[PDB]
Amino acid sequence: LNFPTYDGKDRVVSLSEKNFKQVLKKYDLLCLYYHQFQLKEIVLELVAQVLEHKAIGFVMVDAKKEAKLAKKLGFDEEGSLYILKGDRTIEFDGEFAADVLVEFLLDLIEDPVEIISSKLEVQAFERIEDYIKLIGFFKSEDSEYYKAFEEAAEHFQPYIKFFATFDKGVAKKLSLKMNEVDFYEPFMDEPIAIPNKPYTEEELVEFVKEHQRPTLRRLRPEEMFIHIVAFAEKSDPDGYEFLEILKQVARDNTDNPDLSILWIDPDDFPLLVAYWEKTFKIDLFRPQIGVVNVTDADSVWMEIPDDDDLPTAEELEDWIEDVLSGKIN
Amino acid sequence: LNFPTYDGKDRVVSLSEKNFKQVLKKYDLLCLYYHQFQLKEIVLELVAQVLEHKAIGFVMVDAKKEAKLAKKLGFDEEGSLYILKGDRTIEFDGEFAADVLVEFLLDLIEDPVEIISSKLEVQAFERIEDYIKLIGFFKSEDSEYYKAFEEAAEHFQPYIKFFATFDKGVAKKLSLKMNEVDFYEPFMDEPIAIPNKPYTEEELVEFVKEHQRPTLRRLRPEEMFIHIVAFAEKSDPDGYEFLEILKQVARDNTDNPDLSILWIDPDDFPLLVAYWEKTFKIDLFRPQIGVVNVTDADSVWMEIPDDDDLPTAEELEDWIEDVLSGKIN
Amino acid sequence: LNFPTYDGKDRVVSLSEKNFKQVLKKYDLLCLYYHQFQLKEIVLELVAQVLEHKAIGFVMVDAKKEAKLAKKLGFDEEGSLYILKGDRTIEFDGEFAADVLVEFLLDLIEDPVEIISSKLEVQAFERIEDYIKLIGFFKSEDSEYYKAFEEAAEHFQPYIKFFATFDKGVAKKLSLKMNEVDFYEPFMDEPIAIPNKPYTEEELVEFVKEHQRPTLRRLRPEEMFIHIVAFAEKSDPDGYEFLEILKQVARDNTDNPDLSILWIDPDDFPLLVAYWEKTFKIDLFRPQIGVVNVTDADSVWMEIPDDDDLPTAEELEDWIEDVLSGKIN
Amino acid sequence: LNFPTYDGKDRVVSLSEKNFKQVLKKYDLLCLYYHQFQLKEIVLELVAQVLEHKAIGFVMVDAKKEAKLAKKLGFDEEGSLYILKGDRTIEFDGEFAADVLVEFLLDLIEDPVEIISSKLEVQAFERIEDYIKLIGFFKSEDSEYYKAFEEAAEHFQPYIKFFATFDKGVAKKLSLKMNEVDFYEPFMDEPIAIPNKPYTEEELVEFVKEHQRPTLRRLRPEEMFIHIVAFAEKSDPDGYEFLEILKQVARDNTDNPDLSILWIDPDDFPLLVAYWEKTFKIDLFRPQIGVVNVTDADSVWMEIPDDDDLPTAEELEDWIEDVLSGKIN
Amino acid sequence: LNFPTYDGKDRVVSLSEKNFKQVLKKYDLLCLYYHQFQLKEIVLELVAQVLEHKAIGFVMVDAKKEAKLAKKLGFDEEGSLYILKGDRTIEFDGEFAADVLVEFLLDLIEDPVEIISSKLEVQAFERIEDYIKLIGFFKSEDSEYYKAFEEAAEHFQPYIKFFATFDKGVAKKLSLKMNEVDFYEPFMDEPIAIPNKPYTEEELVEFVKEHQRPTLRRLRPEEMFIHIVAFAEKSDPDGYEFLEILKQVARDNTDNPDLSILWIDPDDFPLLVAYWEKTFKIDLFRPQIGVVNVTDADSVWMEIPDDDDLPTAEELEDWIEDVLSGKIN
Amino acid sequence: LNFPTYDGKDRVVSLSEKNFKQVLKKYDLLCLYYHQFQLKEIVLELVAQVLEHKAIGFVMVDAKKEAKLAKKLGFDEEGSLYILKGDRTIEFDGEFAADVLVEFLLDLIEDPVEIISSKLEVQAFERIEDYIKLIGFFKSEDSEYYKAFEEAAEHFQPYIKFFATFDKGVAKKLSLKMNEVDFYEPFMDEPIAIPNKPYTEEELVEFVKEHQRPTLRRLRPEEMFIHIVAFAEKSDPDGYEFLEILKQVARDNTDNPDLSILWIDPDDFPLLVAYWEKTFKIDLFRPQIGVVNVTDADSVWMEIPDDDDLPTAEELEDWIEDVLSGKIN
Ligand SMILES: [Cl-]
Ligand SMILES: [Cl-]
Ligand SMILES: [Cl-]
Ligand SMILES: [Cl-]
Ligand SMILES: [Cl-]
Ligand SMILES: [Cl-]
Ligand SMILES: [Cl-]
Ligand SMILES: [Cl-]
Ligand SMILES: [Cl-]
Ligand SMILES: [Cl-]
Ligand SMILES: [Cl-]
Ligand SMILES: [Cl-]
Ligand SMILES: [Cl-]
Ligand SMILES: [Cl-]
Ligand SMILES: [Cl-]
Ligand SMILES: [Cl-]
Ligand SMILES: [Cl-]
Ligand SMILES: [Cl-]
Ligand SMILES: [Cl-]
Ligand SMILES: [Cl-]
Ligand SMILES: [Cl-]
Ligand SMILES: [Cl-]
Ligand SMILES: [Cl-]
Ligand SMILES: [Cl-]
Ligand SMILES: [Cl-]
Ligand SMILES: [Cl-]
Ligand SMILES: [Cl-]
Ligand SMILES: [Cl-]
Ligand SMILES: [Cl-]
Ligand SMILES: [Cl-]
Ligand SMILES: [Cl-]
Ligand SMILES: [Cl-]
Ligand SMILES: [Cl-]
Ligand SMILES: [Cl-]
Ligand SMILES: [Cl-]
Ligand SMILES: [Cl-]
Ligand SMILES: [Cl-]
Ligand SMILES: [Cl-]
Ligand SMILES: [Cl-]
Ligand SMILES: [Cl-]
Ligand SMILES: [Cl-]
Ligand SMILES: [Cl-]
Ligand SMILES: [Cl-]
Ligand SMILES: [Cl-]
Ligand SMILES: [Cl-]
Ligand SMILES: [Cl-]
Ligand SMILES: [Cl-]
Ligand SMILES: [Cl-]
Ligand SMILES: [Cl-]
Ligand SMILES: [Cl-]
Ligand SMILES: [Cl-]
Ligand SMILES: [Cl-]
Ligand SMILES: [Cl-]
Ligand SMILES: [Cl-]
Ligand SMILES: [Cl-]
Ligand SMILES: [Cl-]
Ligand SMILES: [Cl-]
Ligand SMILES: [Cl-]
Ligand SMILES: [Cl-]
Ligand SMILES: [Cl-]
Ligand SMILES: [Cl-]
Ligand SMILES: [Cl-]
Ligand SMILES: [Cl-]
Ligand SMILES: [Cl-]
Ligand SMILES: [Cl-]
Ligand SMILES: [Cl-]
Ligand SMILES: [Cl-]
Ligand SMILES: [Cl-]
Ligand SMILES: [Cl-]
Ligand SMILES: [Cl-]
Ligand SMILES: [Cl-]
Ligand SMILES: [Cl-]
Ligand SMILES: [Cl-]
Ligand SMILES: [Cl-]
């Protein structure tokens, strides 16, 4: 009923060789912790307790002990959590917290393609606009074209969402022809149809990698970790009004490939944004947009002194253009 | 740049008497931890480090030691975190996690009334529909009617959001007369104007307490902790389509006072929902709606076997009516 | 519109090493033909043409040439067709004919667990009685207990059909408790509940291997290749009446473990039964039951001279008992 | 013991004139192949080897050589197989495959009337519901009324099954009066008694030709080759549930003469259905129903996107009515 | 439209105990009158009528009756007006007149820190030179450094004006670094930066108390009540020219701590200056400067016989130096 | 030393006829009060006490008693205070308060022409810009042209300030020729030279009456009592910045005769502005500008919702133009 508390049972096992390959096929997902770190230990134990009847294994691989198995799997960063799913290895880069870890694993454990089989689900599909989506129409799950699409979906999981229908009426409402795949940029209503259908998996992966930096995109707690970053609380009328300005500049520079704004909602990342306030010396809980140096953590911020008089989209665009050309960094 | 890690400095001080009343006026907020609890200790230390230059004090009051001060402040639950703000005491009931705690404190530290002074902010105000809102039009901050509204806002902080304008043109767009206050239920576009303006604070608090259980409301990580609960992932086309059905039943029973649905998005509470799956023995990460016994944690769930054929709003309403009348518990 | 004819295009590729592991993950199924055999060549080419847009690869591995890859995969019988599905190897033992091969591959390519999500599907499930079935009730696809059941299903695919539901109402109609699995013998209405739920995969595989020889079972064109064999044309009133007698002896000796009758419908295997007529020197297109020596192909047949006076179930049972004890072989 | 393989002996003789009429009375059945066709050659040779001690002759008539004999017998389609039985000529239109050919010939070689002489056989007769049946009660084989019935049976062989009894007690259980004939439509329990008994052969043939297109009928591998076609796997709980819906619409429109649904089980025709998937661009291995143009191979399919929510019989009937009236083609 | 006249309604309530603490939090400001005084009664009633919809309470505490509450609040001078604001008590020492009282209360009721958020407001800030100002640059209202500054502002309210910005561009124009505070003496353009930023509240209060007696300062009707006093009508060319001489002597003795001139404009205090003319026996409505004994009200005045030949700044400075050394008193 | 309190002595005498004309020449000024009015009584008594050794008489003329003398002097409004100065009668229309009354009388009692005899006084003259000024250059006080100027000055006293010099060097710095008079509009640096010097008194009075409504003018407590009114606190950075915008619109429409803005500083009129807030239902203590109906007290106000983004002078001018043309009233 209330919140779970860790019961003391140690479920995070230590995985050796020979013991290795048995547990990879016992589970859907293998969670590997590569080696004062009682905080990460206890978060991992609580996630393992809460998910104990899911098809997820929790193991730890010591840097000095199972260096054999760590070399066998390619574990560079010590203190990092790696997820194995079949033949694939996923390094978790999100916040090492129980909520974020649970959400990440439950995203990874499901099939990479979500099937839409109802016309009433298409309206809901079209209104979900916060992430990159791909959707295709195939004859069935057995099709070689579905298989190529599913294999591409596995390559981007869980960061990019793939969808498919096998129904003519659903596909008609999505304006999809047979074996065609539409690509949806975030916060844009009109999809891009991938050229020269039907597609191999290499054709799908290459298209998605070209279009992986859209004009505006929303940070997620899973996928994270020169750089234009905008801060807007969607739950606040100020931040929401600013978000609508950012959406307007996104639809004006779909032609511009050198424009990629990362929108961070502070309500989605309250600890991270508060920590960044100490580094950037600015109030990031009111509307801001800046460019950050990846190395030196230097920053320059657009002047938004008055949240009752936010910049228009043209004023944002002019500041953006001065930054790419060279205003300051 | 990356995520904050706790540096070892102990900022959570132990607060005695005589030392007490000085620190209540040094800070905007006083965070009091009432007494194997290294998990809550380390979360509290990391929040204290991240917020160290905010006007927030972090203290701990031992149950056996400062039982004098604990009796002076009324600390019942040991292991609970209490927030002092001026004359007010707030027990934190959310998840004891760094993200949720930071967001709660930054919500509490700000002024309880958000001032809207721009017509472009009204459109954004009207689109924010996920929580109960109140908005009033007053002559200025000095008005006795604003003061009554601000004092009512302080009484419900941070669970219910209060807004005010001092501008005639903003108020005209909100259809607010002078000293009038509109009450917005979640997921309903049309506000309720509080009768017999101008209002005392007791008149505002009494109105809000009558209307505190609306037909549909969304759980928040701050405010939480017989009971109809619906589970819907808004980020998923299935969960979004179900959410739209729940919104439709909400607008059909605004007359019915015995109808209060609590919508929980599992993406907002991934640890809690996964833990509840073990208690309710049902997949709560796909659309579900049930009634839960507060004491015994018994539950009965509507049959939604096929997410490609969700119930219509009429079928939901009939199941709801059978539950209130007596179908099972 | 009419029947497909082979167009001349050679799609059955020759698979070498290094080229090997790429195509195993390009396809759902890999069809490997291990080396005057123009008949098997042309059947394989026509199946490859008809299924060319399914996720199925057709290759050939020469016994002398890719003896490296043939040793790598364990190909004993030359002239045999092996199906690779993930980590699994399936030797096709059925009739080398286009109909039987297509049906086998389309059975293998689908998910080994068929999900039942509708109460109207349970009635149809219960009426399907010609093969061994297993059905379980699990919380979701993510459950470790579903995963054990799915892994057991993969081990017996496509010879034994596995089913699952995630719905309480469906499970109630099947009389299934949570994580319980029911085992259905052919031509018996009442399932056997597998003891000591929840089950590991080794517990499921061991139960199924004990119960793999039921009292009566129907030969299939996929699964085939001391032995009591009964011949009955279900489409003929004579053969149907005899089939009903065989079903009656099956329900009388559920206790007897040394009783396993193989029913062959000649309309399902017209070429094979006609060929066996030349070996057994008896008309197998009218009701017959016999015991066949596996080595010497000797046989002894029950006297059924008059199909207007078929044996009763007691007369069949007495003949069966004389055969196990020792009447003749 | 295993499957037959063709031994090399050439039994398919070439038939000239003068040599012709001798072999027509040597055999029960004469199999005539009218002229890169090594596939049909080798299938015919294997059937001839397997059936070599049956009263069946296998000959080939070249289009250019014995054009005399081909004109004498009326051989239009080259590459077609014609069966001679007494005075009758049967063109085989099924799949040119060894299983289908063996089953066809063994159906044709037997007497066209199956005699039922046991009351226990009547129960089995009544449960066999998948094809059109006729059954009559006569005094004996010598009766002129049996002879008319037998001659009608020969005219429809092997596509329509004829049955007779000479026993009063059997006939009483079938509710047959002396010289009366009952006509059974597929999937309907209640027969139609042919009016104005006793019957001449022309009276029987004319009745059967009027009732040759029933409301629902199952395709057979023998008899095959505007058109409503339904696809349902009886071995699958989904396909079985759909089949039961099709049976329900059949019993609701026994009055409607313009309603004739052809049910194809894909497990009976796996190669043909897979080939049709490429022509109709739809998954025919899950429940579907469509109308197909005989000329252009155009098709329009009922929307069945969700096999957990199949159409009811009323929804099927409404779609059927829209198709006959004119929805699309 | 015209001037307000008192309507007769008695709003100045008498405040008892238990009734006390409720009204302190009902209002922003509590106006307490501590006990032939119909003049002060009627002024207080007119102010209470004019401000009746402001968050200001008007009460009276009788010296003999609520001597309990008067001892509880520390009311020494009878006939005095005390203002309560939160935890603070302010004795009004100005002229007991409706204009002065209204202006005082409206100064006290507002937030002690005025926020500057526009670059165009900085020019206006810099030109306002008649009073002591403090201005700081902080990250936000939530900052512990803003809180210390706000708490210091509350301690000096309304006599010393505090300002803050949260904007980098505004702060750059003010030459303010982060958490730095500048102190502006009256009639001097260049601020003093308070040393060793960031500041606690005790550090700010101690700095302001050292610098509370600047070289020249202008009397206000709020703040008033050995002593060098200068009289100059700024609205008169004579008085304005003299004021410019006084400003010039102020910039020449910023080093001299024993020099504090109080400038009184008679147009700001016409009743008080006219009354002082009877005590000092000199025309104070033309330029004068004198030193007044605080006890005995003795005075000695600089000889300014000819307002067409005012003293230069050097002549003023020499007279000032003779007075501090000892010329007369 | 402190503030004067009324001592009880009754100096406000009642003036009869025959007693009348003696006291008009005993005093410089005669203060006549024309008849529950204990407030005006006590203010008048305190002013009379404070000014008792000035050449000012304080009398009262009852409406019913000395109606003879009231008709002789032309006293319309009862409850009004009339000032006699020689042959002139001045009705006091200001706030009936001791400060305002003292300042008014001390303004009236002095000579209407202020003589400037020093070059250092000219700089101070030129910087005094808040009121209409006239300045002339004459040979001496004996000149007929000075006498005409002095007589015109007496006609406008004390509302319009007149100045004169008799010095060539002072006049050269003012750019004044002999007997020339310059007219200074408020807040404009450049004077208007009155045409066709030398002037009669009727020529001066007629010029001043044409130019008595300048583009911007500041309300005074003396002179007060369709109408554009602007509210700006000069002591506040917001109000000061707005005042500078109003000055800028004043210099852009010196051509426009139908533009006369009345600037009211609320710090100069705190009681009156607070009272007007109740009539105009707007916060007049922050920057506002409106047009007020003289009769109905209706008002329409420019939208200034955001004091961090005040209107520019062009936006003010456009709103002004819409008001004169007809936007609303
Ligand atoms: Cl895995
Ligand atoms: Cl956590
Ligand atoms: Cl899905
Ligand atoms: Cl689906
Ligand atoms: Cl599919
Ligand atoms: Cl499909
Ligand atoms: Cl692929
Ligand atoms: Cl995905
Ligand atoms: Cl298409
Ligand atoms: Cl960027
Ligand atoms: Cl970019
Ligand atoms: Cl902040
Ligand atoms: Cl704002
Ligand atoms: Cl506090
Ligand atoms: Cl945490
Ligand atoms: Cl605000
Ligand atoms: Cl605001
Ligand atoms: Cl305000
Ligand atoms: Cl306001
Ligand atoms: Cl209040
Ligand atoms: Cl709030
Ligand atoms: Cl109103
Ligand atoms: Cl509820
Ligand atoms: Cl409820
Ligand atoms: Cl689940
Ligand atoms: Cl779905
Ligand atoms: Cl594979
Ligand atoms: Cl074949
Ligand atoms: Cl399934
Ligand atoms: Cl399903
Ligand atoms: Cl599931
Ligand atoms: Cl589920
Ligand atoms: Cl497993
Ligand atoms: Cl299976
Ligand atoms: Cl259960
Ligand atoms: Cl056996
Ligand atoms: Cl056996
Ligand atoms: Cl028989
Ligand atoms: Cl023949
Ligand atoms: Cl074949
Ligand atoms: Cl027979
Ligand atoms: Cl018979
Ligand atoms: Cl007979
Ligand atoms: Cl007979
Ligand atoms: Cl006949
Ligand atoms: Cl027949
Ligand atoms: Cl009869
Ligand atoms: Cl048809
Ligand atoms: Cl039809
Ligand atoms: Cl398919
Ligand atoms: Cl207060
Ligand atoms: Cl007053
Ligand atoms: Cl402010
Ligand atoms: Cl501000
Ligand atoms: Cl702030
Ligand atoms: Cl800020
Ligand atoms: Cl502080
Ligand atoms: Cl202040
Ligand atoms: Cl700085
Ligand atoms: Cl002094
Ligand atoms: Cl001094
Ligand atoms: Cl006079
Ligand atoms: Cl007064
Ligand atoms: Cl003068
Ligand atoms: Cl002079
Ligand atoms: Cl003179
Ligand atoms: Cl002169
Ligand atoms: Cl004159
Ligand atoms: Cl004057
Ligand atoms: Cl001149
Ligand atoms: Cl005007
Ligand atoms: Cl005007
Ligand atoms: Cl106000
Ligand atoms: Cl401002």
Side-chain angles (χ1 to χ4, degrees), chain F residues 80 151 161 179 233 235 252:
Chain F
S80 283
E151 287 293 320
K161 300 295 186 189
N179 303 321
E233 295 191 2
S235 67
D252 291 327

Side-chain angles (χ1 to χ4, degrees), chain F residues 103-202:
Chain F
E103 175 73 23
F104 187 83
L105 301 181
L106 292 182
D107 278 329
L108 246 182
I109 197 178
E110 59 199 357
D111 187 288
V113 182
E114 179 164 359
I115 304 310
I116 296 172
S117 293
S118 155
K119 288 184 183 184
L120 283 316
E121 234 189 323
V122 175
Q123 283 83 227
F125 173 83
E126 287 175 333
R127 290 209 86 187
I128 292 166
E129 289 172 340
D130 286 73
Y131 44 81
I132 293 168
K133 311 175 289 188
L134 284 85
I135 191 157
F137 170 39
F138 306 100
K139 186 142 57 192
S140 80
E141 283 177 340
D142 295 359
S143 158
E144 80 175 310
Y145 306 129
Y146 176 80
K147 174 62 168 186
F149 185 79
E150 158 78 28
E151 287 293 320
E154 294 176 30
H155 184 267
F156 293 101
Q157 192 175 23
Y159 308 135
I160 296 178
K161 300 295 186 189
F162 282 64
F163 299 87
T165 188
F166 311 118
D167 188 66
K168 289 167 177 274
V170 175
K172 178 175 178 177
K173 195 177 287 281
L174 295 156
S175 299
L176 281 175
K177 261 51 187 62
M178 179 74 77
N179 303 321
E180 192 198 327
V181 170
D182 275 354
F183 180 92
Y184 287 81
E185 307 265 42
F187 313 105
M188 285 161 197
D189 213 350
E190 329 285 344
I192 301 298
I194 302 184
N196 311 339
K197 73 153 194 156
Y199 322 102
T200 66
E201 188 227 338
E202 295 85 357

Side-chain angles (χ1 to χ4, degrees), chain C residues 213 217 226-229 258-262 290-298 300 323-324 328-329:
Chain C
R213 280 183 170 180
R217 80 183 180 276
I226 306 163
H227 284 19
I228 301 179
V229 294
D258 300 333
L259 182 49
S260 186
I261 301 164
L262 178 68
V291 63
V292 181
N293 197 357
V294 159
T295 322
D296 298 0
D298 314 337
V300 296
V323 175
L324 304 182
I328 186 60
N329 64 34

Side-chain angles (χ1 to χ4, degrees), chain B residues 33-241:
Chain B
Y33 183 34
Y34 191 31
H35 198 328
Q36 302 275 8
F37 61 99
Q38 53 188 2
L39 62 80
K40 286 182 194 162
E41 190 67 53
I42 199 88
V43 168
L44 200 65
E45 294 286 353
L46 182 57
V47 176
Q49 164 185 329
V50 164
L51 303 183
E52 64 177 351
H53 296 323
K54 310 291 221 194
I56 298 167
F58 293 88
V59 287
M60 49 174 48
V61 177
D62 176 75
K64 317 103 181 68
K65 197 187 209 60
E66 317 106 287
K68 183 178 179 180
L69 175 66
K71 284 175 193 62
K72 184 185 193 301
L73 301 166
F75 290 165
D76 285 18
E77 288 89 2
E78 198 174 326
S80 283
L81 193 63
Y82 295 82
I83 317 297
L84 298 195
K85 183 177 189 196
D87 66 317
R88 285 199 73 220
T89 303
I90 301 276
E91 187 183 341
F92 175 74
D93 310 301
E95 183 186 0
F96 208 97
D99 264 349
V100 180
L101 193 59
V102 163
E103 175 73 23
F104 187 83
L105 301 181
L106 292 182
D107 278 329
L108 246 182
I109 197 178
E110 59 199 357
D111 187 288
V113 182
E114 179 164 359
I115 304 310
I116 296 172
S117 293
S118 155
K119 288 184 183 184
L120 283 316
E121 234 189 323
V122 175
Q123 283 83 227
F125 173 83
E126 287 175 333
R127 290 209 86 187
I128 292 166
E129 289 172 340
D130 286 73
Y131 44 81
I132 293 168
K133 311 175 289 188
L134 284 85
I135 191 157
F137 170 39
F138 306 100
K139 186 142 57 192
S140 80
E141 283 177 340
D142 295 359
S143 158
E144 80 175 310
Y145 306 129
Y146 176 80
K147 174 62 168 186
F149 185 79
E150 158 78 28
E151 287 293 320
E154 294 176 30
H155 184 267
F156 293 101
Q157 192 175 23
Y159 308 135
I160 296 178
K161 300 295 186 189
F162 282 64
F163 299 87
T165 188
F166 311 118
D167 188 66
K168 289 167 177 274
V170 175
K172 178 175 178 177
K173 195 177 287 281
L174 295 156
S175 299
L176 281 175
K177 261 51 187 62
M178 179 74 77
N179 303 321
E180 192 198 327
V181 170
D182 275 354
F183 180 92
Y184 287 81
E185 307 265 42
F187 313 105
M188 285 161 197
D189 213 350
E190 329 285 344
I192 301 298
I194 302 184
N196 311 339
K197 73 153 194 156
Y199 322 102
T200 66
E201 188 227 338
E202 295 85 357
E203 281 168 338
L204 295 167
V205 169
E206 245 273 12
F207 186 90
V208 176
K209 278 193 179 183
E210 294 169 330
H211 295 69
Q212 221 174 348
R213 280 183 170 180
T215 315
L216 179 62
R217 80 183 180 276
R218 177 189 200 151
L219 198 66
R220 304 297 171 82
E222 31 179 37
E223 68 182 3
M224 44 160 305
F225 172 81
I226 306 163
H227 284 19
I228 301 179
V229 294
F231 294 79
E233 295 191 2
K234 190 189 173 183
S235 67
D236 193 294
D238 257 347
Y240 190 100
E241 182 199 346

Side-chain angles (χ1 to χ4, degrees), chain D residues 226-227 291-294 296-301 322-329:
Chain D
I226 306 163
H227 284 19
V291 63
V292 181
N293 197 357
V294 159
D296 298 0
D298 314 337
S299 53
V300 296
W301 299 88
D322 292 359
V323 175
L324 304 182
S325 87
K327 181 30 156 194
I328 186 60
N329 64 34

Side-chain angles (χ1 to χ4, degrees), chain E residues 95 99 114 131 235-236, chain F residues 95 99 114 131 235-236 276:
Chain E
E95 183 186 0
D99 264 349
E114 179 164 359
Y131 44 81
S235 67
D236 193 294
Chain F
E95 183 186 0
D99 264 349
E114 179 164 359
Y131 44 81
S235 67
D236 193 294
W276 284 359

Side-chain angles (χ1 to χ4, degrees), chain A residues 54, chain B residues 273-279 281-285, chain C residues 139:
Chain A
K54 310 291 221 194
Chain B
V273 165
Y275 171 66
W276 284 359
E277 280 196 334
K278 304 211 286 176
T279 313
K281 284 310 226 290
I282 197 164
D283 185 1
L284 296 170
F285 292 93
Chain C
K139 186 142 57 192

